[PDB]
PDB file of C-alpha atoms in Angstrom:
ATOM      1  CA  UNK Y   1     123.978 -94.412 231.095  1.00 20.39           C
ATOM      2  CA  UNK Y   2     121.217 -96.803 230.047  1.00 20.73           C
ATOM      3  CA  UNK Y   3     118.372 -94.885 231.686  1.00 24.11           C
ATOM      4  CA  UNK Y   4     115.802 -95.874 229.036  1.00 23.43           C
ATOM      5  CA  UNK Y   5     114.459 -99.365 229.739  1.00 19.40           C
ATOM      6  CA  UNK Y   6     111.738-100.895 227.535  1.00 18.54           C
ATOM      7  CA  UNK Y   7     109.899-103.852 229.076  1.00 19.62           C
ATOM      8  CA  UNK Y   8     111.461-107.240 228.407  1.00 22.02           C
ATOM      9  CA  UNK Y   9     110.374-108.682 225.051  1.00 21.66           C
ATOM     10  CA  UNK Y  10     109.083-105.303 223.879  1.00 21.28           C
ATOM     11  CA  UNK Y  11     108.680-104.714 220.168  1.00 22.91           C
ATOM     12  CA  UNK Y  12     106.738-102.808 217.559  1.00 21.45           C
ATOM     13  CA  UNK Y  13     104.125-104.920 215.759  1.00 23.04           C
ATOM     14  CA  UNK Y  14     102.649-102.747 212.999  1.00 22.31           C
ATOM     15  CA  UNK Y  15     101.647 -99.111 212.709  1.00 21.34           C
ATOM     16  CA  UNK Y  16     101.190 -97.946 216.300  1.00 21.33           C
ATOM     17  CA  UNK Y  17     100.557-101.376 217.849  1.00 17.10           C
ATOM     18  CA  UNK Y  18     103.167-102.669 220.296  1.00 18.29           C
ATOM     19  CA  UNK Y  19     103.815-105.837 222.287  1.00 16.64           C
ATOM     20  CA  UNK Y  20     105.770-106.513 225.473  1.00 17.12           C
ATOM     21  CA  UNK Y  21     105.883-108.272 228.826  1.00 13.90           C
ATOM     22  CA  UNK Y  22     104.164-106.826 231.908  1.00 17.13           C
ATOM     23  CA  UNK Y  23     105.544-103.271 232.357  1.00 19.35           C
ATOM     24  CA  UNK Y  24     107.436-102.382 235.527  1.00 21.11           C
ATOM     25  CA  UNK Y  25     107.996 -98.959 237.072  1.00 16.01           C
ATOM     26  CA  UNK Y  26     111.397 -98.525 235.406  1.00 13.13           C
ATOM     27  CA  UNK Y  27     109.634 -99.018 232.045  1.00 12.17           C
ATOM     28  CA  UNK Y  28     107.123 -96.204 232.618  1.00 11.12           C
ATOM     29  CA  UNK Y  29     109.225 -93.371 231.195  1.00 12.13           C
ATOM     30  CA  UNK Y  30     109.874 -95.335 227.997  1.00  9.77           C
ATOM     31  CA  UNK Y  31     106.195 -96.175 227.513  1.00  9.96           C
ATOM     32  CA  UNK Y  32     105.085 -92.593 228.175  1.00 12.13           C
ATOM     33  CA  UNK Y  33     107.828 -90.255 226.927  1.00 12.07           C
ATOM     34  CA  UNK Y  34     109.088 -92.315 223.959  1.00  9.77           C
ATOM     35  CA  UNK Y  35     106.153 -94.447 222.776  1.00  9.40           C
ATOM     36  CA  UNK Y  36     103.642 -91.804 223.920  1.00  8.53           C
ATOM     37  CA  UNK Y  37     100.995 -94.473 224.468  1.00 11.31           C
ATOM     38  CA  UNK Y  38      97.304 -93.763 224.386  1.00 11.75           C
ATOM     39  CA  UNK Y  39      96.155 -97.170 225.633  1.00  9.75           C
ATOM     40  CA  UNK Y  40      97.273-100.493 227.039  1.00  7.28           C
ATOM     41  CA  UNK Y  41      95.518-103.806 226.414  1.00  2.98           C
ATOM     42  CA  UNK Y  42      96.227-106.353 229.153  1.00  4.23           C
ATOM     43  CA  UNK Y  43      95.467-109.965 228.263  1.00  4.70           C
ATOM     44  CA  UNK Y  44      95.326-111.536 231.747  1.00  2.89           C
ATOM     45  CA  UNK Y  45      92.082-111.633 233.796  1.00  3.32           C
ATOM     46  CA  UNK Y  46      93.705-110.725 237.133  1.00  2.62           C
ATOM     47  CA  UNK Y  47      93.454-107.295 238.716  1.00  2.00           C
ATOM     48  CA  UNK Y  48      95.832-104.681 237.333  1.00  2.00           C
ATOM     49  CA  UNK Y  49      98.542-103.906 239.939  1.00  3.50           C
ATOM     50  CA  UNK Y  50      98.053-100.678 241.848  1.00  2.39           C
ATOM     51  CA  UNK Y  51     101.419 -99.212 240.809  1.00  3.47           C
ATOM     52  CA  UNK Y  52     100.496 -99.707 237.150  1.00  4.54           C
ATOM     53  CA  UNK Y  53      97.020 -98.284 237.792  1.00  5.21           C
ATOM     54  CA  UNK Y  54      98.674 -95.240 239.380  1.00  5.60           C
ATOM     55  CA  UNK Y  55     100.809 -94.893 236.248  1.00  8.22           C
ATOM     56  CA  UNK Y  56      97.570 -94.865 234.244  1.00 10.93           C
ATOM     57  CA  UNK Y  57      96.048 -92.259 236.584  1.00  7.59           C
ATOM     58  CA  UNK Y  58      99.106 -90.011 236.240  1.00  6.26           C
ATOM     59  CA  UNK Y  59      99.457 -90.223 232.449  1.00  8.06           C
ATOM     60  CA  UNK Y  60      95.865 -90.542 231.267  1.00  4.41           C
ATOM     61  CA  UNK Y  61      96.638 -93.810 229.467  1.00  6.57           C
ATOM     62  CA  UNK Y  62      93.466 -95.863 229.136  1.00  3.12           C
ATOM     63  CA  UNK Y  63      93.399 -99.542 230.107  1.00  7.45           C
ATOM     64  CA  UNK Y  64      91.564-102.231 228.183  1.00  8.68           C
ATOM     65  CA  UNK Y  65      91.381-105.781 229.506  1.00  7.86           C
ATOM     66  CA  UNK Y  66      90.466-109.038 227.760  1.00 10.39           C
ATOM     67  CA  UNK Y  67      91.251-111.755 230.299  1.00 10.17           C
ATOM     68  CA  UNK Y  68      92.478-114.868 228.509  1.00 11.19           C
ATOM     69  CA  UNK Y  69      93.014-117.969 230.602  1.00  9.33           C
ATOM     70  CA  UNK Y  70      96.543-118.351 231.923  1.00 10.00           C
ATOM     71  CA  UNK Y  71      96.107-122.089 232.350  1.00 10.10           C
ATOM     72  CA  UNK Y  72      94.420-124.247 228.219  1.00 13.68           C
ATOM     73  CA  UNK Y  73      92.144-122.617 225.665  1.00 13.16           C
ATOM     74  CA  UNK Y  74      91.770-119.163 224.149  1.00 12.04           C
ATOM     75  CA  UNK Y  75      88.218-118.825 222.788  1.00 10.39           C
ATOM     76  CA  UNK Y  76      87.653-117.136 219.451  1.00  8.73           C
ATOM     77  CA  UNK Y  77      85.351-114.496 220.942  1.00 11.77           C
ATOM     78  CA  UNK Y  78      88.084-113.134 223.222  1.00  9.64           C
ATOM     79  CA  UNK Y  79      90.437-112.826 220.245  1.00 12.02           C
ATOM     80  CA  UNK Y  80      87.807-110.912 218.258  1.00 12.94           C
ATOM     81  CA  UNK Y  81      87.141-108.562 221.181  1.00 10.36           C
ATOM     82  CA  UNK Y  82      90.863-107.874 221.559  1.00 11.33           C
ATOM     83  CA  UNK Y  83      91.278-107.274 217.821  1.00  9.63           C
ATOM     84  CA  UNK Y  84      88.459-104.710 217.741  1.00  8.73           C
ATOM     85  CA  UNK Y  85      90.255-102.781 220.492  1.00  9.67           C
ATOM     86  CA  UNK Y  86      93.783-102.778 219.073  1.00 10.44           C
ATOM     87  CA  UNK Y  87      92.800-102.277 215.425  1.00 11.13           C
ATOM     88  CA  UNK Y  88      90.767 -99.167 216.257  1.00  9.92           C
ATOM     89  CA  UNK Y  89      93.045 -96.216 215.362  1.00 10.20           C
ATOM     90  CA  UNK Y  90      91.162 -94.316 218.080  1.00 10.28           C
ATOM     91  CA  UNK Y  91      92.894 -96.610 220.620  1.00  9.90           C
ATOM     92  CA  UNK Y  92      96.502 -96.166 219.275  1.00  9.16           C
ATOM     93  CA  UNK Y  93      99.376 -96.002 220.092  1.00 10.72           C
ATOM     94  CA  UNK Y  94      98.458 -99.130 222.036  1.00 14.92           C
ATOM     95  CA  UNK Y  95     100.603-101.661 223.893  1.00 12.95           C
ATOM     96  CA  UNK Y  96      99.520-105.303 224.067  1.00 10.20           C
ATOM     97  CA  UNK Y  97     100.930-107.367 226.912  1.00 10.78           C
ATOM     98  CA  UNK Y  98     100.269-110.341 229.153  1.00 13.50           C
ATOM     99  CA  UNK Y  99     102.709-111.636 231.774  1.00 11.14           C
ATOM    100  CA  UNK Y 100     105.797-112.283 229.636  1.00  8.92           C
ATOM    101  CA  UNK Y 101     104.536-111.249 226.197  1.00 13.54           C
ATOM    102  CA  UNK Y 102     105.016-114.794 224.883  1.00 13.22           C
ATOM    103  CA  UNK Y 103     101.802-116.874 224.860  1.00 15.47           C
ATOM    104  CA  UNK Y 104      98.576-114.868 225.123  1.00 16.06           C
ATOM    105  CA  UNK Y 105     100.207-111.824 223.527  1.00 14.49           C
ATOM    106  CA  UNK Y 106     101.777-114.029 220.861  1.00 18.77           C
ATOM    107  CA  UNK Y 107      98.461-115.672 220.002  1.00 16.51           C
ATOM    108  CA  UNK Y 108      96.669-112.354 219.489  1.00 17.27           C
ATOM    109  CA  UNK Y 109      99.439-110.795 217.400  1.00 18.43           C
ATOM    110  CA  UNK Y 110      99.563-113.888 215.204  1.00 15.29           C
ATOM    111  CA  UNK Y 111      95.916-113.188 214.399  1.00 12.49           C
ATOM    112  CA  UNK Y 112      96.858-109.609 213.480  1.00 15.23           C
ATOM    113  CA  UNK Y 113      99.481-110.952 211.076  1.00 14.30           C
ATOM    114  CA  UNK Y 114      96.793-113.233 209.637  1.00 11.16           C
ATOM    115  CA  UNK Y 115      94.677-110.158 208.878  1.00 13.31           C
ATOM    116  CA  UNK Y 116      97.770-108.761 207.161  1.00 13.50           C
ATOM    117  CA  UNK Y 117      97.712-111.954 205.050  1.00 12.62           C
ATOM    118  CA  UNK Y 118     101.140-113.110 206.163  1.00 12.78           C
ATOM    119  CA  UNK Y 119     102.095-116.688 205.392  1.00 13.96           C
ATOM    120  CA  UNK Y 120     101.628-119.034 208.330  1.00 14.48           C
ATOM    121  CA  UNK Y 121     105.338-119.860 208.093  1.00 10.69           C
ATOM    122  CA  UNK Y 122     106.322-116.290 208.975  1.00  9.37           C
ATOM    123  CA  UNK Y 123     103.513-115.793 211.503  1.00  8.29           C
ATOM    124  CA  UNK Y 124     104.606-118.837 213.503  1.00  8.75           C
ATOM    125  CA  UNK Y 125     108.286-117.948 213.089  1.00 10.49           C
ATOM    126  CA  UNK Y 126     107.647-114.476 214.510  1.00  9.96           C
ATOM    127  CA  UNK Y 127     105.592-116.029 217.311  1.00 13.59           C
ATOM    128  CA  UNK Y 128     108.388-118.463 218.168  1.00 15.62           C
ATOM    129  CA  UNK Y 129     111.090-115.777 218.135  1.00 12.99           C
ATOM    130  CA  UNK Y 130     109.183-113.872 220.833  1.00 11.40           C
ATOM    131  CA  UNK Y 131     107.978-116.993 222.653  1.00  8.59           C
ATOM    132  CA  UNK Y 132     111.343-118.745 222.837  1.00  7.58           C
ATOM    133  CA  UNK Y 133     111.940-120.979 224.742  1.00  8.27           C
ATOM    134  CA  UNK Y 134     108.288-121.603 225.420  1.00  8.94           C
ATOM    135  CA  UNK Y 135     106.694-121.722 222.037  1.00 10.10           C
ATOM    136  CA  UNK Y 136     103.352-123.504 222.394  1.00  9.41           C
ATOM    137  CA  UNK Y 137     101.778-125.515 219.602  1.00  8.36           C
ATOM    138  CA  UNK Y 138      98.373-124.478 220.960  1.00  8.68           C
ATOM    139  CA  UNK Y 139      98.934-120.744 220.447  1.00  9.87           C
ATOM    140  CA  UNK Y 140      99.804-121.419 216.810  1.00  9.01           C
ATOM    141  CA  UNK Y 141      96.874-123.827 216.511  1.00 11.04           C
ATOM    142  CA  UNK Y 142      94.541-121.069 217.725  1.00 13.46           C
ATOM    143  CA  UNK Y 143      95.982-118.711 215.103  1.00 10.55           C
ATOM    144  CA  UNK Y 144      95.536-121.327 212.380  1.00 10.45           C
ATOM    145  CA  UNK Y 145      91.927-122.019 213.419  1.00  8.74           C
ATOM    146  CA  UNK Y 146      90.789-118.469 214.177  1.00  7.70           C
ATOM    147  CA  UNK Y 147      87.900-117.559 211.881  1.00  6.39           C
ATOM    148  CA  UNK Y 148      88.599-113.915 211.003  1.00  7.41           C
ATOM    149  CA  UNK Y 149      85.547-113.387 208.777  1.00 10.90           C
ATOM    150  CA  UNK Y 150      83.779-111.291 211.418  1.00 12.46           C
ATOM    151  CA  UNK Y 151      86.659-109.011 212.429  1.00 11.68           C
ATOM    152  CA  UNK Y 152      87.552-108.461 208.771  1.00 11.45           C
ATOM    153  CA  UNK Y 153      83.928-107.576 208.078  1.00 12.62           C
ATOM    154  CA  UNK Y 154      84.055-105.194 211.054  1.00 13.97           C
ATOM    155  CA  UNK Y 155      87.446-103.871 209.911  1.00 14.24           C
ATOM    156  CA  UNK Y 156      86.584-103.234 206.251  1.00 13.64           C
ATOM    157  CA  UNK Y 157      83.437-101.331 207.241  1.00 13.31           C
ATOM    158  CA  UNK Y 158      85.635 -98.894 209.186  1.00 12.65           C
ATOM    159  CA  UNK Y 159      88.469 -99.010 206.607  1.00 15.11           C
ATOM    160  CA  UNK Y 160      91.168-100.122 209.027  1.00 10.79           C
ATOM    161  CA  UNK Y 161      92.689-102.414 206.402  1.00 10.94           C
ATOM    162  CA  UNK Y 162      95.275-102.616 205.095  1.00 11.65           C
ATOM    163  CA  UNK Y 163      97.282-102.016 208.263  1.00 11.86           C
ATOM    164  CA  UNK Y 164      99.787 -99.217 207.703  1.00 10.51           C
ATOM    165  CA  UNK Y 165     103.502 -99.428 208.431  1.00  9.35           C
TER     166      UNK Y 165
END
């Protein structure tokens, strides 16, 4: 029958953190009835579409928004702000998405893997699997350069680490 339809490029990340492309109406029942989301973090600065907003009104799912340029640069302070949102267990289950779930989403998640102390080899390889065919050197460069001292200091204080599978 194939009535369940996750958004393109959807996947679990860790714990109750998810990633995907921009959800469409036919994805709503999966996000709500199966993932049972509490929040969504959108990574593009544009206005959330009305149909998606209506979905949020109907379900009670809260929207967070950290608008990263869709040019390019992703400043460190936007990554830290996004991490504080998604790592807060009070915001989960949470879905992270941008337009296609490849670049801006991939950059943020790579920073999550860095907090999990993954090797850069496997972080970039996971990024490229989701980003194919448009893997960007810059997204990986941002991951490699991101100074995670602050968010780790914030995270340890709350006892969010280690992230739980």
